[PDB]
A paper describes a structure:
The bacterial injectisome, or type III secretion system (T3SS), is a specialized syringe-shaped protein-export system utilized by many pathogenic Gram-negative bacteria for the injection of virulence proteins (effectors) into host cells. The injectisome can be divided into three major regions: the inner- (IM) and outer-membrane (OM) spanning basal body with associated export apparatus and ATPase components, an extracellular needle, and a terminating pore inserted into the host cell membrane called the translocon. The major structural scaffold of the basal body is comprised largely of three proteins that arrange into a series of highly oligomerized, concentric rings: two intimately associated proteins localized to the IM - PrgK/EscJ/MxiJ and PrgH/EscD/MxiG, and a third protein belonging to the secretin family of OM proteins, InvG/EscC/MxiD (Salmonella enterica serovar Typhimurium SPI-1, Enteropathogenic Escherichia coli (EPEC) LEE and Shigella dysenteriae nomenclature, respectively). In summary, we report the crystal structures for the cytoplasmic and periplasmic domains of PrgH and InvG, two of the main basal body components of the prototypical Salmonella SPI-1 injectisome.
A ∼20° subunit rotation in the hexamer of the crystal structure accommodates the tighter packing but superposition of the interface secondary structural units shows significant conservation with both interfaces having similar buried surface areas (640 Å2 vs. 546 Å2 for hexamer and 24mer respectively). Collectively, the crystallographic packing interfaces we observe support and mirror the low energy interfaces generated in our modelled basal body. This would be consistent with a model whereby the soluble domains have low-affinity interaction surfaces for oligomerization, which can be captured by the high concentration in the crystallization experiment. FHA domains are frequently involved in interaction with phosphothreonine (pThr)-modified proteins. In Shigella, the PrgH orthologue MxiG was reported to interact with phosphorylated peptides from the secretion apparatus protein Spa33 although a separate study failed to corroborate these results, and structures of the Yersinia orthologue YscD revealed an unconserved phosphothreonine binding motif. Protein sequence alignment of the PrgH orthologues indeed illustrates that the conserved residues involved in phosphopeptide binding in FHA domains are poorly conserved. To validate this, we engineered mutations of the PrgH residues corresponding to the proposed phosphothreonine interacting residues in MxiG - Arg35, Gln42 and Asp65 - to alanine. These mutations have no effect on in vivo secretion assays. We therefore conclude that the PrgH cytoplasmic domain is unlikely to interact with pThr-modified proteins. We note however that the FHA phosphopeptide interacting loops in our PrgH structure are accessible on the cytoplasmic face of the ring model, suggesting a potential interface for protein-protein interactions.
Author numbering:
A (entry chain E), B (entry chain D), C (entry chain C), D (entry chain B), E (entry chain A), F (entry chain F): 14 to 119
The structure:
Amino acid sequence: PYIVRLLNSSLNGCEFPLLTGRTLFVVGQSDALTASGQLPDIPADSFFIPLDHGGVNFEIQVDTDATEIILHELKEGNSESRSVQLNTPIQVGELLILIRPESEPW
Amino acid sequence: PYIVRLLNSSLNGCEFPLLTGRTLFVVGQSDALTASGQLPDIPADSFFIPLDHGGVNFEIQVDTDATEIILHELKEGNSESRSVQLNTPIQVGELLILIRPESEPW
Amino acid sequence: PYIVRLLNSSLNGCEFPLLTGRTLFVVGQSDALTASGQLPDIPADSFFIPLDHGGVNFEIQVDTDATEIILHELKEGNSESRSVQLNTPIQVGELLILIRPESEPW
Amino acid sequence: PYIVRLLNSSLNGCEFPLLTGRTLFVVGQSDALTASGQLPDIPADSFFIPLDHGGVNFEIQVDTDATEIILHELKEGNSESRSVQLNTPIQVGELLILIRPESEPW
Amino acid sequence: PYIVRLLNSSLNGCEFPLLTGRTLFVVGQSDALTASGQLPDIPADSFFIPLDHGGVNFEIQVDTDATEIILHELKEGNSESRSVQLNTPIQVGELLILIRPESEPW
Amino acid sequence: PYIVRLLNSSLNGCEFPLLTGRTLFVVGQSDALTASGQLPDIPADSFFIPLDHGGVNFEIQVDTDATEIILHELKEGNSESRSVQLNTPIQVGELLILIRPESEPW
Ligand SMILES: [Ca+2]
């Protein structure tokens, strides 16, 4: 399985496990956080990341096979889907992340 | 069953599952959120969505069959009903949502 | 069992179940909400409803028989009681509510 | 047993059970509330209330017999005690309370 | 066993049970409270007390025998200890507390 | 088993267990705290420590053997690693910490 690590933001170093399928990252200010509590405590498929400026929500999708990883950047009324590589910094809005095999520490 | 997906707001991407019968969405600023905690932690039939402008509460009704979905936009002392289709954006106040089957991600 | 539905306020559409005996609704601004957390998480007999203007605290009494429903507005150092009809809008200060049987959606 | 009812404030109508022995009421602004969560969820013996001005904490002691009720107002490094009666408004700081038998609503 | 009673602060009159061994009191503003939730819900060996100014964290140590009581005031990278007597106001920073036997009400 | 004790900050005195493997400490202001709630309630591998100035996120890795302890400071786009000792004050940015065997109180 794969892990998303933050390489910047006040949560730099935080590591989030990804489930097979879709994981949502909500990225933004106060208004989003306190409301994100709306989602149940089910095995976490959405996470909130605080960022004061330039935050863009995104999903990561890990195919059932774990052979392709797709990042869906969620813009106004549309999304931009990109193929992404492991163990490399990936910029999403003003956030910088890395996706690593669980067994390969960064 | 069906899932309500936000297509704008700070929570763009967030997905809320619908139960048979009735689910309420409270859409608005700070005053509503902190108070929405008043409702018990029972299987979630009301959700809060932050929106800084143009938020209008609405409830979705799904029949026992799960073949018809009606949205009721809640105005002052009254409501306005509309039939909805799956997989199509729906504008309620300034919020844009889409209703999808669980099995067809969007 | 009866349900109180809000017909206005930022919480328009919210529905609160009524227990036999007494249910209190505290209606007002920010100061009341954050402090209403003082009351335990026991089966809910008190609710907070935000209203920027004209909010009047009230309690509702359901007799053991469920044949009469009494509403008390909690004014300064006094209260004003009245019988209320089911399935009809009821104004309390500037809040508008409706009490319905759990079996009759509005 | 007995019930403490608030007869004024934004929280007019709130009812709290008095326990056998000693019950403490913490009265004041935001700073006290969020911190009152420090106390465990044991059968409630301290309770918080909000009051914008003149909030004085107080404790009520009830004898084994339930015939005497002593209220202690908690001032700086000292307390001022008085015997109180049932079903009679009692002023404590800016707050007006009333202590009633459970079986006798106000 | 022994109880810590607050003799000032917004929580004046609050009484915290002490366990044999070391109990931590974190005393300060908002930043500490919300983060104190980090500590597990194990039998409470930690308490948060709100104080807007002059708050100092401290530990109370009750030897296994319950014959000596030591307060450790926490400073930068070090602590300063003193023996404390029962039933007398103890100043820690701007907080005022009193340690009593459970059987001797203050 | 090893324990991290804070020797400064508003949480001076708080202690955090270290798990075998990796533990992250997020050290900063308000924005990080409220959002750190994003991480699940799984056996705690990240913790948040408030510090108004000079906070540096850092992670500690305890080898499977429990014979070496390595602390990594998480700077901008990079990390800095060093061996650290038990039972001695360790400066990490402006935080002061100490790591002890659980069996040896401090
Ligand atoms: Ca007596």
